[PDB]
Amino acid sequence: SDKIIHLTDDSFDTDVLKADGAILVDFWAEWCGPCKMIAPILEEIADEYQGKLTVAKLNIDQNPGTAPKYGIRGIPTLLLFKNGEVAATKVGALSKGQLKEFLDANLA
Known part of the structure; x- marks a missing residue:
């Protein structure tokens, strides 16, 4: 997207x-x-959390190198980074509501 970084x-x-x-x-x-x-939902989040976080996507077929470094086994996997270090791991599709809660809890 416009606000999503494509990694x-x-x-x-x-x-x-x-x-x-x-x-x-x-x-x-x-x-x-x-x-x-989850793609459309990641779009809403990127709007709503503007100034608090940035959303980024890595397609693991087009970019096969990065996933092994983080032990990624299955997709989707959402990894919250804070200044370069994983703060929180989430795996699987969740709803918008579940994602808000994941973010609010880990961004504090």
């Missing part, structure tokens, strides 16, 4: 590891239905 293996360090703030990274794939189901 690559090469831009991962700069976009995620070096950002001064919180980043919600979504590891996903085109063949993964639940990944597709």
Whole structure:
């Protein structure tokens, strides 16, 4: 999206590891239905949390290098980073409501 950062293996360090703030990274794939189901929701979140976090997506087929580094086994997986370090791990599709709660609880 407009506000979502579209990540690559090469831009991962700069976009995620070096950002001064919180980043919600979504590891996903085109063949993964639940990944597709959460896409519109990640869009709303990126609007609503503007100034508090940035949403980023890494497609793990197009960028196969980064997932192994974080032990990612299954998708979708959402990893909350705070200044380069994973604060919180979430796995599986959740609803908008569940995601708000995940974020509010871990951003404090």
